[PDB]
Amino acid sequence: QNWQHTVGKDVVAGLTQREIDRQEVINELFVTEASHLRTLRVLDLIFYQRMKKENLMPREELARLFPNLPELIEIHNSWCEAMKKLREEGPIIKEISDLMLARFDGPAREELQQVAAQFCSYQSIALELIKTKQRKESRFQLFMQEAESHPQCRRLQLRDLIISEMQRLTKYPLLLESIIKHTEGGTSEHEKLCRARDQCREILKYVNEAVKQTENRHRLEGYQKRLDATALERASNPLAAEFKSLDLTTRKMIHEGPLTWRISKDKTLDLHVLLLEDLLVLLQKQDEKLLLKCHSKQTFSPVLKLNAVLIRSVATDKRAFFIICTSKLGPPQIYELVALTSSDKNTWMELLEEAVRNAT
Amino acid sequence: AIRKKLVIVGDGACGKTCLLIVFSKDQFPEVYVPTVFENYVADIEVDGKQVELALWDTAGQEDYDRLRPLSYPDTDVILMCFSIDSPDSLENIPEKWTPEVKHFCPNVPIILVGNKKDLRNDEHTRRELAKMKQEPVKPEEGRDMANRIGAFGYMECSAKTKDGVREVFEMATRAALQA
Numbered sequence: 001q002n003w004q005h006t007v008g009k010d011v012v013a014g015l016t017q018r019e020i021d022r023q024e025v026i027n028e029l030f031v032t033e034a035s036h037l038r039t040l041r042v043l044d045l046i047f048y049q050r051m052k053k054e055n056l057m058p059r060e061e062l063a064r065l066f067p068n069l070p071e072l073i074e075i076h077n078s079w080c081e082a083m084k085k086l087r088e089e090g091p092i093i094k095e096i097s098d099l100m101l102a103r104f105d106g107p108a109r110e111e112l113q114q115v116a117a118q119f120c121s122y123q124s125i126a127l128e129l130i131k132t133k134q135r136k137e138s139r140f141q142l143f144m145q146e147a148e149s150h151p152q153c154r155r156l157q158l159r160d161l162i163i164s165e166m167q168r169l170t171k172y173p174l175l176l177e178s179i180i181k182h183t184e185g186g187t188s189e190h191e192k193l194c195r196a197r198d199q200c201r202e203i204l205k206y207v208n209e210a211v212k213q214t215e216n217r218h219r220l221e222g223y224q225k226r227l228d229a230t231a232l233e234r235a236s237n238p239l240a241a242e243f244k245s246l247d248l249t250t251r252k253m254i255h256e257g258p259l260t261w262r263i264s265k266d267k268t269l270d271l272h273v274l275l276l277e278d279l280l281v282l283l284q285k286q287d288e289k290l291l292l293k294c295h296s297k298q299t300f301s302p303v304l305k306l307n308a309v310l311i312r313s314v315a316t317d318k319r320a321f322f323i324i325c326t327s328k329l330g331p332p333q334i335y336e337l338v339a340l341t342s343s344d345k346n347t348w349m350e351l352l353e354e355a356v357r358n359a360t
Numbered sequence: 361a362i363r364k365k366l367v368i369v370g371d372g373a374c375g376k377t378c379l380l381i382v383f384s385k386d387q388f389p390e391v392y393v394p395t396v397f398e399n400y401v402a403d404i405e406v407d408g409k410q411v412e413l414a415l416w417d418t419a420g421q422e423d424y425d426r427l428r429p430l431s432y433p434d435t436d437v438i439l440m441c442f443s444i445d446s447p448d449s450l451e452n453i454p455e456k457w458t459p460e461v462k463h464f465c466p467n468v469p470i471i472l473v474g475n476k477k478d479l480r481n482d483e484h485t486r487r488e489l490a491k492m493k494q495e496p497v498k499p500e501e502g503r504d505m506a507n508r509i510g511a512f513g514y515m516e517c518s519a520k521t522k523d524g525v526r527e528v529f530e531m532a533t534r535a536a537l538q539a
């Protein structure tokens with residue numbers, strides 16, 4: 001159970017309380033790495049290999065679910081074996097900072113974040129497909145019930161085993177932190193773990209980021225199917241006329257959400273706005289449609305180019321902010337947009353200013 | 361608990377932005393940043409009535425003529441400004457600003473404001489005026505411009521010295537509150 005309960009009371013005989021508590025945390029790292037590698041091998045053997053052999057879906061669809069499982073397994077296997085190689089020279093594990101850098105620093109860091117990114121990016125979309133595939137096919141629902149009842153899964157479903165990589169990458173930083181808690185402060189060891197810890201959070205951010213980006217690409221795809229830009233073919237507003245056949249897919253989404261638009265005195269319109277790299281598109285909803293319209297008071301353009309806007313705070317309203325369209329060829333305009341809370345106003349403002357700067 | 365909107369207009373660098381910041385923040389900014397569009401708030405009490413004052417700052421520069429009409433829409437009082445150190449600044453009152461204001465803001469009361477009162481008796485300022493055969497501005501013609509343009513009233517101030525600044529915004533508020 002404990003590190004203390006293993007090894008021996010003979011072997012802890014001559015050790016400080018700090019050193020023991022330190023061994024207890026290091027052990028936890030080693031043991032849970034062994035569990036995570038095995039969880040990955042369960043994915044490989046019970047799901048990936050059986051699906052491959054039995055042709056349950058097309059190859060490209062299967063590669064999307066497990067893009068690089070063998071390579072991911074190789075990462076945690078090589079690390080796990082280096083841990084085991086360390087345990088060979090006595091149950092009291094000494095300097096451990098060199099082990100941690102070998103996985104979270106330099107090339108290693110590059111290798112790990114690339115693979116983990118690729119493995120987790122699309123995963124939420126793939127899982128949903130799997131859920132829908134089960135309602136569609138009897139033959140696939142039979143396989144999923146067979147595979148999830150396998151002993152090796154130990155009563156776990158696919159969704160629980162596959163999310164384990166994220167869980168693991170989200171745990172690394174807390175696990176290092178406890179080791180650092182119980183290390184002599186101001187030693188070479190201490191600084192190096194800190195360096196290792198810092199990079200874990202970087203990798204965390206990097207992978208969450210790629211998940212965030214892929215999820216966004218997928219949301220845009222969805223939004224493109226529901227886009228009605230029909231009114232933009234009748235033109236009149238020269239700026240709006242540019243976007244008669246918009247296509248969101250060619251751009252990345254930065255942010256999105258509901259804003260109320262103060263078009264006039266005692267005239268409001270609820271929108272759902274998208275912030276993209278180069279554009280701010282204001283979208284109105286009918287039922288399941290996403291409308292692009294002009295909107296009268298001379299008209300407003302539903303799509304604004306970020307390289308021709310100004311961002312300013314409404315001083316009387318900490319919920320509201322101005323976007324001023326400075327596009328030439330047409331009269332300039334004031335969009336007054338209201339956020340849900342003050343904190344939400346600040347979040348929009350912040351992301352807006354950043355995107356305008358990068359556009360300009 | 362009443363709200364009123366004020367727009368300040370006048371020539372480039374005649375002291376429009378500084379006059380608002382001194383009144384609203386109570387500090388004077390030292391670096392000059394040419395305004396494109398800016399929004400401020402201030403609270404004031406006048407004649408036993410509480411008022412929120414939205415300050416709409418505009419560009420005096422020519423390049424931004426096209427942006428300026430976007431601040432005019434629902435204006436309760438206009439601060440029309442000129443510099444005392446710039447004499448070309450007042451001839452632009454009846455030739456550019458009044459026409460502009462009366463067009464976008466008809467029957468909306470106008471306050472005529474003389475800015476940079478501190479530079480009247482500054483020797484360095486008067487000497488450079490002479491080079492253009494020109495001298496600083498007195499209060500009589502200020503009064504006249506104001507009578508000529510059908511202004512509500514007339515005021516002199518200094519943003520640097522803080523002199524007479526609040527006295528400006530009192531009249532502006534009385535103007536908005538009146539009718």
Ligand SMILES: Nc1nc2c(ncn2[C@@H]2O[C@H](COP(=O)(O)OP(=O)(O)OP(O)(O)=S)[C@@H](O)[C@H]2O)c(=O)[nH]1
Nearest residue numbers: 372373374375376377378392394395420476519520
């Ligand atoms: N001596 C003196 N200088 C002033 C006074 N007010 C502003 N200034 C100076 O004049 C310059 C312009 O003032 P500022 O308020 O920024 O002009 P502006 O009317 O806003 O100019 P713009 O935004 O239309 S382009 C600044 O460098 C400032 O130091 C004043 O009351 N006295």
Ligand SMILES: [Mg+2]
Nearest residue numbers: 376377395418
């Ligand atoms: Mg200004």
